[PDB]
């Protein structure tokens, strides 16, 4: 069954359908639209698709309905089970895709999961890249994300224009799962950098320091970090909103620990950070930004 | 007993004597010499004073001998007991200082220690500021240190030209001990940022990632940090040299934990970092840079 034309010509072989219009996904998809690649969106909560429909983007009834109409499906949903649902569920991408479609998972999970998604997709003649990102909500909005990619090198090149719409530095990491691998490494660092900021701030408050001055000093050598630059201003204002959700970091850390166990590496800091974030979720603060640790 | 003239006119009331020509002290003192403030040095190991003597700087026989010849004594020795020795030992600064001399401790210890040094010094008519620094060896060499100062505000202003010779951003934190307080806050962040880098790198190596690419990704949003910028290149090369000594970080963290205990604040990350660095010292690696944690 063929279909009517959409925003992006078929002959481009670059029609993109985007699944998951969240804190990251909405801005990423908007950038794709600005660049002329976005044909369609799907979001579980329909209301988030409204601003896209208002710009003429096709709003799909399901992932399958989206896949049948595009050449590249980008997924920016929460966790690996969520990716499994959108790709392999009853009305998932595989039910509508044609062979040669490429799936790009830009969410964070693990190398093992990326390899599994690729293997399953391959049965349907579907290609796969894992291209998780760093730079946060701000990067997504600004289009400056650093994107780290695993998969066929030829596909990385083919899709570079698409990645460039959303990000600035686009790095090919290696075969499938190597993007998630780099992301997990990144998350160890982000988590611990965040714990570092939160603990320093707790100490600074206990010591009665002037927060204007604390912020000035910390925004430099070499205490300074991405976590501080992205989140200290919000944190000082008591804005605990994401940002990056605590539950998502907890999930990332779990994947970090699984890899570390498999490989015989001891990561005591990552283990602590996982515990702290697990507790934050348990306590009901899973939807707050990670910068709210210790302050929720 | 009056003395012959030295490099810096007495009428300036800005003659500086520098005690502790280590990784930080040598470059800091050199900057003071370039700026025309350095009259004298003292170092326990005489050989380190040679490059200063070659430029005409008076090499003192003791801290007392130095103090009698200068208006400002800057101390950049290792730990608080070392400061006590140079200030209050048998031939310490107090034995040669005249009332009105100002002591500036630029080393890292604690607010309690700064207050104690000031109180003891005050008996002799000696003024005191705690002005610890951040920016590392590189900052010291480049003259770009961020300097955080506790003490009389009037003295902070008086000494600004001196601080500016060594640093760029000079921040008045508050009364005596407030400089060390900010430094301790900074150290929580530096320690955890360092653990973050080391753990990420350990994971990256386990995952077989290309270190060129790992470095590129980490040198950005928002995994990026001062620790990464200062030390990742050395670490990738296997250069474990300080930099900032592990034993010194261990000492800083101990002071952090004392304050946290006094004030009822729980800092589980700082506690872990203290344990890790304590172990590093126990293992014989106390003189390596902090970036060598996990790799020594
Ligand atoms: N936020 C950051 O700073 C950041 C940075 C880099 C990477 N990441 C990673 O990127 C991914 C998305 O993060 P985010 O911050 O955009 O999260 P978010 O704001 O929570 O958005 C999650 C999105 O996924 C959708 N979704 C979740 N489960 C689903 C399912 N089972 N079926 C269909 N749709 C589903 C949500 O739909 P609804 O709208 O219906 O809820 C929403 O569109 C996560 O893996 C996160 O770890 C986040
Ligand atoms: N390195 C960094 O990145 C950095 C950055 C900011 C702050 N700091 C802090 O700055 C201070 C100095 O650090 P550093 O890296 O310069 O250390 P360092 O290289 O180990 O130098 C220590 C200096 O103190 C002297 N010293 C130590 N104990 C002494 C004593 N009892 N009597 C007399 N002199 C003594 C040493 O003399 P000898 O030459 O005879 O050994 C040396 O000159 C430390 O408190 C450190 O925590 C360091």
Automatic annotation (TrEMBL), chains A, B:
<dbReference type="InterPro" id="IPR002204">
    <property type="entry name" value="3-OH-isobutyrate_DH-rel_CS"/>
</dbReference>
<feature type="binding site">
    <location>
        <position position="78"/>
    </location>
    <ligand>
        <name>NADP(+)</name>
    </ligand>
</feature>
<dbReference type="Pfam" id="PF03446">
    <property type="entry name" value="NAD_binding_2"/>
</dbReference>
<dbReference type="GO" id="GO:0016491">
    <property type="term" value="F:oxidoreductase activity"/>
</dbReference>
<feature type="binding site">
    <location>
        <position position="251"/>
    </location>
    <ligand>
        <name>NADP(+)</name>
    </ligand>
</feature>
<feature type="binding site">
    <location>
        <position position="43"/>
    </location>
    <ligand>
        <name>NADP(+)</name>
    </ligand>
</feature>
<feature type="binding site">
    <location>
        <position position="245"/>
    </location>
    <ligand>
        <name>NADP(+)</name>
    </ligand>
</feature>
<feature type="binding site">
    <location>
        <position position="23"/>
    </location>
    <ligand>
        <name>NADP(+)</name>
    </ligand>
</feature>
<dbReference type="InterPro" id="IPR029154">
    <property type="entry name" value="HIBADH-like_NADP-bd"/>
</dbReference>
<dbReference type="Pfam" id="PF14833">
    <property type="entry name" value="NAD_binding_11"/>
</dbReference>
<dbReference type="GO" id="GO:0051287">
    <property type="term" value="F:NAD binding"/>
</dbReference>
<dbReference type="InterPro" id="IPR036291">
    <property type="entry name" value="NAD(P)-bd_dom_sf"/>
</dbReference>
<feature type="binding site">
    <location>
        <position position="44"/>
    </location>
    <ligand>
        <name>NADP(+)</name>
    </ligand>
</feature>
<comment type="similarity">
    <text>Belongs to the HIBADH-related family.</text>
</comment>
<feature type="binding site">
    <location>
        <position position="243"/>
    </location>
    <ligand>
        <name>NADP(+)</name>
    </ligand>
</feature>
<feature type="binding site">
    <location>
        <position position="82"/>
    </location>
    <ligand>
        <name>NADP(+)</name>
    </ligand>
</feature>
<keyword id="KW-0560">Oxidoreductase</keyword>
<dbReference type="InterPro" id="IPR008927">
    <property type="entry name" value="6-PGluconate_DH-like_C_sf"/>
</dbReference>
<keyword id="KW-0520">NAD</keyword>
<feature type="binding site">
    <location>
        <position position="24"/>
    </location>
    <ligand>
        <name>NADP(+)</name>
    </ligand>
</feature>
<feature type="binding site">
    <location>
        <position position="45"/>
    </location>
    <ligand>
        <name>NADP(+)</name>
    </ligand>
</feature>
<feature type="binding site">
    <location>
        <position position="248"/>
    </location>
    <ligand>
        <name>NADP(+)</name>
    </ligand>
</feature>
<feature type="domain" description="6-phosphogluconate dehydrogenase NADP-binding">
    <location>
        <begin position="15"/>
        <end position="174"/>
    </location>
</feature>
<dbReference type="GO" id="GO:0050661">
    <property type="term" value="F:NADP binding"/>
</dbReference>
<dbReference type="InterPro" id="IPR006115">
    <property type="entry name" value="6PGDH_NADP-bd"/>
</dbReference>
<feature type="binding site">
    <location>
        <position position="21"/>
    </location>
    <ligand>
        <name>NADP(+)</name>
    </ligand>
</feature>
<feature type="domain" description="3-hydroxyisobutyrate dehydrogenase-like NAD-binding">
    <location>
        <begin position="177"/>
        <end position="291"/>
    </location>
</feature>
<dbReference type="InterPro" id="IPR013328">
    <property type="entry name" value="6PGD_dom2"/>
</dbReference>
<protein>
    <submittedName>
        <fullName>6-phosphogluconate dehydrogenase, NAD-binding protein</fullName>
    </submittedName>
</protein>
<dbReference type="InterPro" id="IPR015815">
    <property type="entry name" value="HIBADH-related"/>
</dbReference>
<feature type="binding site">
    <location>
        <position position="108"/>
    </location>
    <ligand>
        <name>NADP(+)</name>
    </ligand>
</feature>
<keyword id="KW-0547">Nucleotide-binding</keyword>
<feature type="binding site">
    <location>
        <position position="48"/>
    </location>
    <ligand>
        <name>NADP(+)</name>
    </ligand>
</feature>
